[PDB]
Amino acid sequence: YTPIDISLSLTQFLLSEFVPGAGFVLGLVDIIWGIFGPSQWDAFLVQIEQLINQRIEEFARNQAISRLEGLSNLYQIYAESFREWEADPTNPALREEMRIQFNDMNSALTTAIPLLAVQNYQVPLLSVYVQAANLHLSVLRDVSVFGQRWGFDAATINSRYNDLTRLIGNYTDYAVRWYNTGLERVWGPDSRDWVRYNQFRRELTLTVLDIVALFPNYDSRRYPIRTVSQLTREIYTNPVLENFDGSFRGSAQGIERSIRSPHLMDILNSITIYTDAHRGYYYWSGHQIMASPVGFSGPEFTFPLYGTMGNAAPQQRIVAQLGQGVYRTLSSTLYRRPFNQQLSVLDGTEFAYGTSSNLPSAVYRKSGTVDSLDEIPPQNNNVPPRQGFSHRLSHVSMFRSGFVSIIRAPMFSWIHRSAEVNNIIASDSITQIPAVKGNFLFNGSVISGPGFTGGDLVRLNSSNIQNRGYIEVPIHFPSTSTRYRVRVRYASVTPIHLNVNWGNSSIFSNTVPATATSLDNLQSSDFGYFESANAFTGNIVGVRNFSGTAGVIIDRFEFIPVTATLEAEYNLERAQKAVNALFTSTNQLGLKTNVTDYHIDQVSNLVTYLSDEFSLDEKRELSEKVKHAKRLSDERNLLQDSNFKDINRERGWGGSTGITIQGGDDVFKENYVTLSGTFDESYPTYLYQKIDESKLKAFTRYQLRGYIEDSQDLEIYLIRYNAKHETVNVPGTGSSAHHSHHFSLDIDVGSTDLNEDLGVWVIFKIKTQDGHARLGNLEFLEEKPLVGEALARVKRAEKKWRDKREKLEWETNIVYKEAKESVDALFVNSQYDQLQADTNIAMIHAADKRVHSIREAYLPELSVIPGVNAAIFEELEGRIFTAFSLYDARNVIKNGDFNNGLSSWNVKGHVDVEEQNNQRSVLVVPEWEAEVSQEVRVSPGRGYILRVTAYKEGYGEGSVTIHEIENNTDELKFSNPVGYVTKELEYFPETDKVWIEIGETEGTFIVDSVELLLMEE
Amino acid sequence: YTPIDISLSLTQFLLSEFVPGAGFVLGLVDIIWGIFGPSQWDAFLVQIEQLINQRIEEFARNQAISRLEGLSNLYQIYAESFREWEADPTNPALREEMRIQFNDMNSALTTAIPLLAVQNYQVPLLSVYVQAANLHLSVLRDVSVFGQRWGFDAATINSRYNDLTRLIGNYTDYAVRWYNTGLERVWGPDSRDWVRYNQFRRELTLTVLDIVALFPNYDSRRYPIRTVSQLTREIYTNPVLENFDGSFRGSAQGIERSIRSPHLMDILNSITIYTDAHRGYYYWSGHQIMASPVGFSGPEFTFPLYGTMGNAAPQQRIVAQLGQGVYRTLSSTLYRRPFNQQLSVLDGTEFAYGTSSNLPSAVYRKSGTVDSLDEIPPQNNNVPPRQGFSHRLSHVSMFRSGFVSIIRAPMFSWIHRSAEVNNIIASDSITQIPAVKGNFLFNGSVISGPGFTGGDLVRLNSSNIQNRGYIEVPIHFPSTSTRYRVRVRYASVTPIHLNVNWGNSSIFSNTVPATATSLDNLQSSDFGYFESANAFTGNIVGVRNFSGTAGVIIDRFEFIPVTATLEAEYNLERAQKAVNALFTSTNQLGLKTNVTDYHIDQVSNLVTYLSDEFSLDEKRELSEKVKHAKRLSDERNLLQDSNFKDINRERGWGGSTGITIQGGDDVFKENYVTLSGTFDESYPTYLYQKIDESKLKAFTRYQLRGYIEDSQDLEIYLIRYNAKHETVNVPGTGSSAHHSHHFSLDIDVGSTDLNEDLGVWVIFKIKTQDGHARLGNLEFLEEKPLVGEALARVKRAEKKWRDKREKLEWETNIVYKEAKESVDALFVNSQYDQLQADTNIAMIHAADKRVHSIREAYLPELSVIPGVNAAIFEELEGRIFTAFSLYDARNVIKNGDFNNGLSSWNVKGHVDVEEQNNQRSVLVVPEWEAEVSQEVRVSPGRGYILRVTAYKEGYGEGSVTIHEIENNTDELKFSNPVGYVTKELEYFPETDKVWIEIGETEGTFIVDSVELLLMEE
Ligand SMILES: [Ca+2]
Ligand SMILES: [Ca+2]
Ligand SMILES: [K+]
Ligand SMILES: [K+]
Ligand SMILES: [K+]
Ligand SMILES: [K+]
Structure with missing residues (x-):
């Protein structure tokens, strides 16, 4: 019969029938707007006014009640029109009437709510304000579903939809704010203050917060079909304190502390009660609570003894989880307060259970007349209280004092019955399980809700790895065959990566957006949603906070049936x-x-x-x-052969060994490239390609780019007017160092000239042993035309390369001449047939060095790429290789160059042949006892030239000598940055055998070549 | 017929029959020791001597061959004795002979091996050295299995077992070392140098490394039953280069680079060959290779074109994976070298396949007589080459030159046939799969083996989280029903946490030890093992390197059948x-x-x-x-109620609200404690307990300890002579900040005195809101007696507390007297019945402050714990609470104290009642227009005392006035750190009603109490 009774009846409807339709519209009239007079609105104001002890100003209060009246009358018209339109949707009059009634309803409300939020009296007005706002939201939610069907155009529906969501937030934040400051305003130091304080809290949770908690579900788009919420908050009664005919000083903090702080929800299993005695008055002195987690999904737990052990009588375990729990307490109080020792306790309480039928009430000692049901009444008056109750007993803590006065004041938590003992998932509606109904909280806290959630929330903390915040909820599925998408309501101040598991499998893992800008004063619009991409049919449900850095509030899990x-x-x-x-x-x-x-x-x-x-x-x-x-x-x-189908098949890809093309990957979906390292820095792994001028456009930037799965020591070149080059190391990822797998590199084209044919060289290089890369999806592309500074830089680059060419082209005319003449001086001139009789190796070597002083025969970056001067260098070096060939063929001495180490030579001591300047091999005589010698066949009577090219390290003299058996021995002697002397002599064998013998006196002797030749002009 | 043939025959035996027994002993004689003369040993030395081009010194060489002979003769005796003992195990003569023969065999070997490792000629001796060491290891491995059964005592078996493992390492490191420096010694700049170089590598891999690679398997304890290894290394032939009748200059680096660097193993699928033409000579100019990963567990892949495309004739795909792969190539070479252009290529090759039966050989163009089978001969000569080959063709790369001379020199990799195309797991033996036979390498490299592994290894790099190094191997299980423990051979320089997966499940995850002290020069004993604890029956196998910091080498996976x-x-x-x-x-x-x-x-x-x-x-x-x-x-x-069964049931646990006891946990296996925060710092969450002196022992340290699952703001106290206290924050773990979940805290006992009864207070406290702890397994225990400094510290602490007591005990005699007299002055002396008529509130308040200047009524740390002075403080404050009670009862004014805010008062303006010093409530008149008043009933004719206690802020005067209707109004006026004045007057009502009215002129007026009393003596 009181506002709390009325609220609880709306609350039930809103929990059980929350779905757009005529059943909804019709529900509100029957419960509220169709059946309330001005006395009912009066009654609501008085509920809060009495409490906060100050009445609303009369004009404001008068204004308020006549508006509420205007709205009863209006909504009755809208409901009656809604009803009739429903029965005949296509009738254009019934539809115009729907449109008009809606407009008028929207006007009245927009105008009337500010009059229920009037300064100085926002608090005493709140619950009624709540009523008008609940109603405002539903008409807005109506038009957003049925608007189109009534004849409203999309423009106007979206406007009023945008209003709808703007106002879920506003109306919620408003109510919550004024609840807060009303609650604080009524706090005070004594037990009396606490009674008013708690009574405020309890009554306003019942007529205010509960409704507000349902406000989100009006979001048609988030909740297209029926959606069931659960209220988990606790409310408190305290018999002893609540009709103590006095007040205990400075006790309200002590009392308030005897309420349990924010916890995971639990079921009350039993209370075991201790009777004590004072002047032959027997009383409840202490007691103990057992509890289980939600869904009995865990073993039971307990708490330290409440109050104090008593032994005046046996003790009495009262079992709470029978039927549907305890829904009611009838309590006997005792107050001995004899004229002058003091007593304030309970001498008995009946606990009564909720059942669809009947259960004997468990009595501690005796019943009494301090009925809890005055304070926490039924939601349903169509049935006995045992069926129609709104709350289950949730816990019984205690406020105590001990040994001048005795207080034993058991404190009763009532949780709303929408908080089901189990987490059952429906299949025809969206099911809302608040995270607080979980049973495993690792690395995080429960912290009290702000009022607009129905209960408390879950905080998951920031990390690092094995310290991830985690909340696990057990869930039962009546219907196995049903497919559900999971949605989570959350709050964070930063974008966080979150993983949602279902059973043992992980159904969502990505980074969701921020929704808030501080987690301390939490506002309605501070919450948001994310969902799994798919829909499924394990048996628990979970979220993990992957962030090392920020925290996240998890409100609730939402299961959404889907085809x-x-x-x-x-x-x-x-x-x-x-x-x-x-x-x-x-x-x-x-x-x-x-x-x-x-x-x-x-x-x-x-x-x-x-x-x-x-x-x-x-x-x-x-x-x-x-x-x-x-x-x-x-x-x-712009690259030819994108998918590396033809490497080396020259006008596409140039490639070395240590490359591999596989078709696809964890990363790549097309042909891709793996490069491995090299054992020698001079023999790199290389993939290169030229980009033809004809494909380039003048005065334009171009971009090389692609994707690297991973990389180490990858050398990337872009070459036109000069070479730019990155070295690139990229670690892999699962699912100096580059944090990204995408790379890019830019170059700028000046004037294009097909005749000069620069193009762009693209080169990938690895010149180290540990060393590798996996890349693909390579593009060379046109980006943007060149403007401003970039333009003037490119003009400078080309101009500068242009000046470098002229230079190069000038110096190359000198050197080529020089080298080509030195080359020619080696030959008998008759087209590369013969060496002049008296050209020696040092000469061949000297000519060679004049050839190799040619500067751009090969590209510095990768010397397989011909340069400006590849043509001319190449011909000259071949004339040189011809020349060495001729040197060798004519030498009557086998292996006189030491180009095959020591073969064809007879060696006595310790001697070595070492390479020194390119292929050039030298004999090292390190000690005088060593002897390298060769027997050579000759033509007696002919004449020979013995030529030695060598030099002498240190003291003494190096010798090559020559002889036959007995008298005919002759000698070349060497004594004294790295350069060789050439000596010779004329020898005339008397016989068919000669001996050549290399030796030395001391120090070290180094011989480039020993040659023996016929004199023949 | 050559040492390579002999080795390959041992190699096969060692791969296929590696199991302790007579079959093993008998195998070695039949293959080697029973059937070799001194010419065979000569033959072995010559193989390497010819190669490295320098013969062993004659005495050394002579010594060497006669030792090898001594050993042939000896081992023949041991084998014959082994055989006969096997046939009749219990015959004590056959057993004594076994013992003796073993001893002699062990002597000869220990003495003879150093003579095969002689300075300056270690290299040319190596393979024979390898032979003697293979043999040494097996006799040691014999005695370790059969020793007991022959009659050797455990002491001697373990000594020779320790020898066995000492020598697997030594002999391996030796061989590997000298292979290295022999190999380096023979490297050189030209193609000729390469031929010798590779020939060394290939021949010594065949007669040396392969055997050495098997050396671990001699570990009886690691390999109790048959165990099968796989050799994965590649060997190389190069027809063109290998019988080129000359040498190409500075080409050996170029040639060597045409060998593939370390890779995951792959199967050669096909070669597609390009014919070109030069002076109407048709040749192999280029070719392309397809390959698949091990077990065709992946899609095929390919490589950039080897050599150069040619079009002289069609092209020719030769398929390699027919039968068992290609086991042989017969190659035709061409050398045009006309007197002065140059050519060095292949004009044809037959590829022949391994089959149990027969397959036509695929011919490129034509066969030739450069048989690969001279270089890579069969392992089995009891069958045709097609059945008895040792190698499969593995890859064909190329060394090239191009457009003076032309080189097209295809390079053939041969992998040993023990490298199976698939990774099949046996069930009757331990199966060794080297990690290199894997198909997924993430974040790591293959790097060339050191020689003693049979092939290359896998490096997994250090991290951070989604970059874990991983190697995945595909594996087939012929027998589903078989249970296997997985063992991994690995190397690391630090202890690393490693996870091994099998299929999708993770079968090992813990930190394994270090085994090495550098991963660069890897020695035999640098490797180690770990195993899963259980044994199982998925289809791949994997290791993940969990370390953020260090790398790890994975050698091989080992599957071990188990009942x-x-x-x-x-x-x-x-x-x-x-x-x-x-x-x-x-x-x-x-x-x-x-x-x-x-x-x-x-x-x-x-x-x-x-x-x-x-x-x-x-x-x-x-x-x-x-x-x-x-x-x-x-x-x-030493703690009572360990499992928190009786908290608060006083002489066990003291506990507040916000505590919870559940039976067990992810962490705890016994009853444990959860503490949550507080809303007010003065109302902390506390679990405490005293430890009785009678349980303590003098001059002894004690230790408080336990385990905290996790924690925040946990305040831990230990209190005897003084209080020590940690604050403890511990993050949870999965499976300022404390990195450990174990905590401990120490305290020291001086002299114990039962009369003084100090004990030790143990206190857990949380005084913040965010704030929590989960702990259990709490011990209080005796640790150690006190010695040295700790002793003299404790003597100082007690002495100092002793001096603090005397002080306290002195100051408390003064104050108590003072407070107790002030208390008494309040009362009519007749036992706490009445207040003196003229004692006012300020007096009660002043007495109260003399009581509350008592210093240790309560323990500072937690004021629920009585202190020295709890007894005396308590009695006095109750006399005070009595006194306030009396003040109130006698006041004819309802609520004259403002202890119930403003009830019983009529208020006109804006006025507030605020608490100021403890429960003490004051009325604040902030403005002159405000009016607080009360109508009081009186006895006409009697006499009353109107007493006010108040003071005046600022200007003007505060008034309490009193009156009846018309002429009888009188007044108390107040004008002018925080202290009150008390005024009074005598009033005599003519009527039955009086009015008391509080007011002021301006400024602010503050009233403690207003009292009206009958004058009655
Ligand atoms: Ca030379
Ligand atoms: Ca007062
Ligand atoms: K906020
Ligand atoms: K162009
Ligand atoms: K090492
Ligand atoms: K004792």
Whole structure:
């Protein structure tokens, strides 16, 4: 019969029937607006006014009640019109009437609510304010569903939808704010203050917060179908204190502390009660509580003894989880306060259970007349209290004092019955399980709700790895066969990566957005949602806070029944949006330049995951477009042989050993490239390609880019007017150092000239042993035309390369002449047939060094790439290689150069042949006892030239001598940056054998070549 | 017929029959020692001498061959004795002969090997050295298995077992070292140098490394039963280069680079060959290779074109994976070298396949007579080459030059056939899969093996989280029903945490030891093992490097068939060792003091995981002991109610609200405690307990300790002579900040005195809101007696507390007297019946402050704990509370104190009642227009005293006035750190009603109390 009774009846309706329709519209009239007079509105104001002890100003109060009246009358019209329209949807008069009534309803409300929020009296007005706002939200939510069907145009529906969500927030934040400051205003130091304080809290939770808690569910778009919330907050009664005919000083903090702080929800299993005695008055002195987690999903637990052990009588375990729990307490109080020792306790209490039928009430000692049901009344008056109660007993703590006065004041928590002992998932509606109904909290806290949630929330803390915040909720599924998408309501001040598990499998893991800008004063719009992409049928549900850095508030888990067509639709929209975002324009004719080749690959992946069972028509369509995008990417890609199909087959890819092409990957979806290291720095692993001038456009930046799975020591070159080069090390990822796998590199074209034919060299190099790379999706592309500084830089670069060429082209005319003449002086001039008789090796070597002083025969960066001067260097060095060949053939001495180490030589001591300047091999005689010798056949009577090219380290003299058996021995002697002397002599063997013998006196002797030749002109 | 043929025949035996027994002993004689003369040993030396071009010194060489001979003769005796003993194990003569022959065999070998390792010629001796060492290891491995059965005593078997493992390392490191420096010694700049170089490498891999690679398997204890290894190394042939009748200058680096660097193993699928033409000579100009990963577990891949495309003739795909792969190439070479252009290529090659039957050979163009089978001969000569080959063709790369001379020199990799195309797991032997046979390498490299592994290894790099190094190997199980323990051979320089997965499940995750002290020059003993604890029956196998910091080399995976009894045994030993390590001594009578209660809990967990099917007898036994340990822990534990069964039931645990006891946990196995925060700092969450002097021993340190799952703001107190206190924050873990969950805290006892009864207070406190702890397994224990500094510190602490008491005990005699007299002055002296007529509130308040200047009525740290002065403070404050009660009852004014705010008062303006010093409530008149008034009933004719206690802020005068209707109004006026004035007057009502009215002129007026009293003596 009181506002709390009325609220609880709305609360039940809102929990059980929350779904757009005539049942809803009709529900509000029957419960409230159709059946309330001005005395009912008066009654509501008095409830809070009495409490806070100050009445609303009369004009304001008068204004308030006549508005509420205006609205009863209005809404009755809207409801009656709604009803009739429902019965005949197509009747245009019934529809116009719907439109008009809606408009008028929206006017009145917008105007009347500010009059229920009037300064200085916001508090005593709140619950009624809450009423008008609950109603405002539903008409807005109506028009957003039925608007179209009534004849409103989309423009006007979205405007009023935007209003709807603007106002879920506003109205909620308002109520919550004034509840707070009303609550604080009524706090005070004594037990009397506490009674008013708690009574405020309890009454206003019942007529205010509970409704507000349901306000989100008006979001038609978030909650298209029936959606069931659960209120988990606790409310408190305290018999002893609540009708103590006095007040205990400075006790209200002590009393308030005897309420349990924020916890995971638990079921009250039993109370075991201790009787003590004072002047032959027997009383409840202490007691003990057992409890279980939600869903008896854990073992039971307990708490330290409340109050004090007593032994005046046996003790009495009262079991609470029988039927549906305890819904009522009838308590006997005792106050002995004899004229002058003092007593304030309970001598008995009945605990009564909720049942669809009947259960004997468990009595501690005796019943009494301090009925809890005055304070926590039933929600349903169509049945006995045992059936129609609103609350279950949740815990019984205690405020105590001890040995001048005795206080034993048991404190009763009542949780709302919408808080089910188990977490059962429906299948025809969205089910809301608040995270607080969980049973495993690792690295995080429960912290009291701000009022607009129905209860407390879960904080998961920031990390690092094995310290991830985690909340686990047990959940039962009546219907196995039902497919659900999970949605989570959360709050964070930063974007956080979150993983949601279901059973042992992880159904969501990505970074969700921020929603707030501080987690301390939490406002309605501070919360948000995310959902799994798919829908499924394990038996628990969980969230993990992956962030090392920030925390996250988890409100509630939401299970959303879904058909397979719905599923296929969600993913289609998602993928359709992806493909479209590749193109510049609405006609899909061009790619956005900053869309990379690899990106187009990620997006195509999305398409192939679409159902073949429900989306084929519209999936094929999408795959047309993404293939089309890709084709356009290949069009803009200026590199030949993109997929490395023809490396080395010259005008495509140039490549070395230590490369590998596999077709695909964890990362790559197309042919890609693996490069491994080298054992010698001079023999690098290289993939290169020239880009033809004819494909380039003047005065334009170009961009080399691609994707590297991972990398170490990867050397990347871009070469036109000069070479730029990155070294690139990129670690892999799972699912100095580059944090990104995308790379890019820019170069700028000046004037293009086909005749000069610069182009752009693209070169990938690895010159170390540990060393590697995995890359693909390589593009070379046109980016932007050159403007401002970049332009003047390029003009400077070309101009500067232009000046470097002229220089080079001048110095090369000198040197070539010089080298070419030195080359010619080696030969008998008759076209590369013969060496002059008297040209020696040092000469060949000297000519060689004049050839190798040619500066751009080969590109510095990678010397397999011919330079400006490749043509002319090449011909001269071949004339040189011819020359060494001729030197060798004519030498009557086998291996006189030491080019084959020591073969064809007879060696006595310790001697070595070491290479010194290019292929050039030298004999080292390190000690005088060593002897290198060769027997040579000759033509007796002919004449020979013995030529030695060598030098002498240190003291003494090096010798090459020559002889036959007995008298005919002759000698070449050497004594004294690194340069050789050439000596010779004429020898005339008497016989058919000669001996050549190399030796020395001391120090070290070094011989380049020993030659023996016929004198023949 | 050559040493390479002989080696390959041993190699096959060692791969296929590696198992202790007579088959093994008999195998070595038949293959080697029983059938070799001195010419065979000569032959071996010549193989390497010819190669390195320098013969061994004659004495050394002579010595060497006669030792090898001594050993042929000896081992023939040992083998014949082994054989005969096998046939009749119990015959004591056959057993004595076994013992003797073993001793002699061990002597000869120990003496002869140093003569095969002689300075200056270690290299040319190596392979023969390898032979003698292979043999040494097996006799050692024999005696370690059969030793006991021959009659050797355990002392001598373990000595020779220790020798065995000492020498697997030594002999391996030796061989490997000299292979290295022999190989380097023979490197050189030209193609000729390369031929010798590679020929060395290839021949010495075949006669040396391969054997050495098998050396570990001699570890009887690691390999109790048959164990099969796989050689994965590649060897190389190069037809063109290998019988080029000359040498190409500075080409050996170029040639060497045409060998593939370290890779995951792959199967050669096909070669597709390009014919070109030069002067109407048709040649192999280029070619392309396809390959697949091991087990065709991946898609195929390819490589950039080898050589150069040619079009002189069609092109020719030759398929390699037919039969068992290509085992042979017969190659035609071409050398045009016309007197003066140059050519060095192949004009044809036959590829022949390995089959149990027959397959036509695929011919490129034509066969030739450069048979690969001269270089890579068969292992089995009991069958045609097609069946008995040792190698499969593995890859064909190329060394090239191009457009003076042309070189097209295809390079053939041969992998040993023990490298199976698939990774098949046997069931009757241990199967060794080298990690290199994997198909997924993430964050790591393959790097060339050191020689003693059979092939290359896998490096997994240091991290951070989604960059864990990982190696995945595909594996087939012929027999589903077989149970295997996985063992991994690895190397690391630090202890690393490693996770091994099998299929999708993770079968090992813990930190394994270091084995090495640098990963660069890897020695035999640098490797180690770890194993899963259990044994299982997924289809791949993997290791992940969990370290953020260090790298790890993975060699090979080892699968070990096991029965269920074996399993149950492994875990029993493991748990038996755990339980024993709890006790001080061999009689399990005492606990080791540094074994914590929680530790005993971890160890009991280990016991409950033992099989009930195979271990019951010996598991029950173990559970007796661990329960016994635990019982002893409770014995030493000096805390009452360890498992928090009786908190608050006073002489056990003292506890507040916001505590919870659950029975067990992810962490705790026994009753444990959860504390949550507080809303007010003055109302903390507390668990405390005193420890009785009678349980303490003089001059001894004690230790408080326990385990905290997690914690924040946990305040821990230890109190005797003074209080020490930690604040403790401990993050949780998965499976300022404390990195450990174990805590401890120490205190020291001086002299114990039962009369003074200090004890030790143990207090857990949380005084903040965010704030929590989860702890259990709490012990208070005796640690050690006090010695040295600690002793003199404690003597100082007690002495100092002793001096603080005397002080306290002196000051308390003064104050108590003072306070007690002030208390008494309040009363009419007749036992606490009445207040003196003229004692006012300020007096009561002044007396109160003299009571509350009592210094240790309550323990500072937690004021629920009575102090020295709790008794005397308590009585006096009750006399005070009596006094306030009396003040109130006699005041004819209702609520004249403002202790119930403003009730019983009529208020006109804005006025407030604020609490100021304890419960003391004051009326604040802030403005002159305000009016607080009360109508009081009186007895006409009697006489009353109107007393006011108040003061005046600022200007003007505060008034309390009193009156009846018309002429009888009188007044108390107040004008002018925080202290009150008391005024009064005598009033005599003519009527039955009086009015009391509080007011003021301006400024602010503050009233403590207004009292009206009858004058009655
Ligand atoms: Ca030379
Ligand atoms: Ca007062
Ligand atoms: K906020
Ligand atoms: K152009
Ligand atoms: K090492
Ligand atoms: K004692």
